[PDB]
């Protein structure tokens, strides 16, 4: 039985979510050079936001990487964000152009992000026509506003407020209000956040990052 030498560790979420205990992980025990707490330092979980809070919003999934283990508690830190596949394919219909941009914005804590966006053009309620397309200058300057907001509203913040912005998507509502003089948009999401480089791990920042 190779399942006799496996202890069950607990995994703790960061402080931005309501619910902290997200589930139970496994490691073979220390019998040699293979230490347990290095044996899990690379676990990445795809955890939905209707699991980290008890809201209904299920389409926005989070990546949380275990950086240090204290007691039997795995302490996680934020690794990225995705939309699910059925939400992002539910929104590509015909008769609307889709405006997608990406920026690499460096936060004030040393962390580098890459933020992907999406946006579609909304058809009007008194409209007759079948097709709702934008011209190319409208797509170019809506994309310019999109990259400008997504570097300005992430640029001078710490990481905890960035993940606090990413939970309700204030950035998507801000883009949709600011871009309405060019073409009225339809649901605008930050689709994917990547974490490209992380700075040196020291325990005080994570131990204050849990509360």
């Amino acid at each position: 039985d190779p399942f006799s030498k496996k202890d069950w560790y607990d995994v703790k979420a960061p402080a931005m979510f309501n619910i902290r205990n997200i589930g139970k992980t496994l490691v073979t025990r220390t019998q040699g050079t293979k230490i347990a707490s290095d044996g899990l330092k690379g676990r990445v979980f795809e955890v939905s936001l209707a699991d980290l809070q008890n809201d209904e919003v299920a389409f926005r999934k989070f990546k949380l990487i275990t950086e240090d283990v204290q007691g039997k508690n795995c302490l996680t830190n934020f690794h990225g964000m995705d939309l699910t596949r059925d939400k992002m394919c539910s929104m590509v219909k015909k008769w609307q152009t889709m405006i997608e941009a990406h920026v690499d914005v460096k936060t004030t804590d040393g962390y580098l992000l890459r933020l992907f966006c999406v946006g579609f053009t909304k058809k009007r309620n008194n409209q007759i026509r079948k097709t709702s397309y934008a011209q190319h200058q409208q797509v170019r300057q809506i994309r310019k506003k999109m990259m400008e907001i997504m570097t300005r509203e992430v640029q001078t913040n710490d990481l905890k407020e960035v993940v606090n912005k990413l939970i309700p998507d204030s950035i998507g509502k801000d883009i949709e209000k600011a871009c309405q003089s060019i073409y009225p948009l339809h649901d605008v999401f930050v689709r994917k956040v990547k974490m490209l480089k992380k700075p040196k791990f020291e325990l005080g920042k994570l131990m204050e990052l849990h509360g």
Binding site: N126, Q127, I128, R129, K130
Partner: protein, 128 residues
């Protein structure tokens, strides 16, 4: 299947166009009617003709049949509307103002029995 063929429902109708003053709603009278008014070979055709003129007289006296002639209208001119006040005698006729410009440029509209109503805002009449 008991569907009546061409002869028992064309011959029954040409029996019904003339001789309507003899026919009725009971089958046994019309069965006895059918030998004075025709020359039919043997009785199973005659009972089938009598059954269709009984079914057609069951149908015909509450409205018009397509196949029957206006001998029906000879029955409706023999047996058989306006209101008291006409539906074109209304006392206020709403007029949207392009019609009022037309009537003013037809040398009417000095006389007023009409009342012009407010023009529509919005031009969304098409379908998407």
């Amino acid at each position: 299947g008991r569907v009546r063929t061409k002869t028992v429902k064309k011959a029954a109708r040409v029996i019904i166009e003339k001789y309507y003053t003899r026919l009725g709603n009971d089958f046994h009278t019309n069965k006895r009617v059918c030998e004075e008014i025709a020359i039919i070979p043997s009785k199973k055709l005659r009972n089938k003709i009598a059954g269709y003129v009984t079914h057609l007289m069951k149908r015909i006296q509450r409205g018009p049949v397509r196949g029957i002639s206006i001998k029906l209208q000879e029955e409706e001119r023999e047996r058989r509307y306006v209101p008291e006040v006409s539906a074109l005698d209304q006392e206020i006729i709403e007029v949207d103002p392009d019609t009022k410009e037309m009537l003013k440029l037809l040398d009417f509209g000095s006389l007023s029995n009409l009342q012009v109503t407010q023009p529509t805002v919005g031009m969304n009449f098409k379908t998407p």
